[PDB]
Scaffold this active site. Sequence first.
Site, mmCIF file in Angstrom:
data_model
loop_
_atom_site.group_PDB
_atom_site.id
_atom_site.type_symbol
_atom_site.label_atom_id
_atom_site.label_comp_id
_atom_site.label_asym_id
_atom_site.label_seq_id
_atom_site.Cartn_x
_atom_site.Cartn_y
_atom_site.Cartn_z
ATOM 1 N N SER A 41 0.788 -1.244 0.000
ATOM 2 C CA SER A 41 0.000 0.000 0.000
ATOM 3 C C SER A 41 0.825 1.303 0.000
ATOM 4 O O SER A 41 0.253 2.345 -0.042
ATOM 5 C CB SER A 41 -1.030 0.049 1.152
ATOM 6 O OG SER A 41 -2.124 -0.777 0.855
ATOM 7 N N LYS A 44 0.006 3.402 -2.903
ATOM 8 C CA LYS A 44 -1.178 4.260 -2.880
ATOM 9 C C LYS A 44 -0.786 5.734 -2.873
ATOM 10 O O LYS A 44 -1.597 6.604 -3.234
ATOM 11 C CB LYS A 44 -2.065 3.956 -1.663
ATOM 12 C CG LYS A 44 -2.849 2.625 -1.729
ATOM 13 C CD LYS A 44 -3.808 2.532 -0.525
ATOM 14 C CE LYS A 44 -4.846 1.424 -0.678
ATOM 15 N NZ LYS A 44 -4.213 0.079 -0.529
ATOM 16 N N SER A 96 -6.247 3.109 4.205
ATOM 17 C CA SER A 96 -5.732 2.238 3.157
ATOM 18 C C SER A 96 -6.861 1.510 2.409
ATOM 19 O O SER A 96 -6.781 0.304 2.146
ATOM 20 C CB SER A 96 -4.756 1.233 3.770
ATOM 21 O OG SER A 96 -3.745 0.921 2.840
#
Length: 263
Positions: A41, A44, A96
Amino acid sequence: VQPAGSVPIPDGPAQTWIVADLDSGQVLAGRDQNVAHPPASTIKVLLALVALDELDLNSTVVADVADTQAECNCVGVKPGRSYTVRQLLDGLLLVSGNDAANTLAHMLGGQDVTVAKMNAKAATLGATSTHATTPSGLDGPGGSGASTAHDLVVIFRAAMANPVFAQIIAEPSAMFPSDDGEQLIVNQDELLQRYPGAIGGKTGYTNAARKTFVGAAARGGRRLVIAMMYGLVKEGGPTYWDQAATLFDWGFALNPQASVDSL
């Protein structure tokens, strides 16, 4: 590895890492900072950069069913409901949310073109060892993807240059639309509360990536950015929060005029 004459850097679970100056772009220290591993993540952040580059914070989208179906974790996007880009960024960065990731990709033209835009953006930044396979950092068609500690701080440094990002990533909480009718979402980056002067960070985990992290902190007008990849916390061992604090503390204690390389 580190400046001649500087003190030992305590080891931690992360197998690769780097410590850099957020403003100057100088490297203070690193371990295998150019070795590729899956980003999870942390990627991201690269998605958020593309969204910020292309989308107005007030722009809205009505989520499709596919947008709302994703692997853990989700912020709680619901089909047929409307969301702003700011709201999706909150869900993406604070908790997330993979549904938030899905829904931003929708706005940027779909999964495939979003991943392509992410990879083009990384190339423009000099993050040339980064290959995203999904907008979320989950495994996808091309596999687990790749980045390096070096590339992660390059990407995070570019994100921090956008004051919208710097604000959201450091937000303790936000209000997110729900089907009755708002839910408090709380920033999962515990470094905000654990380490004073922390100004933001993004954690990640998949089985393939193990644990990953990229984030920044400030002390006395100096700002550092770190990234940490491919680590597992053992029972009774140092956590990612411990190692992050140790890297920041080592970096701020280092002679301010010393560096080993440039990003």
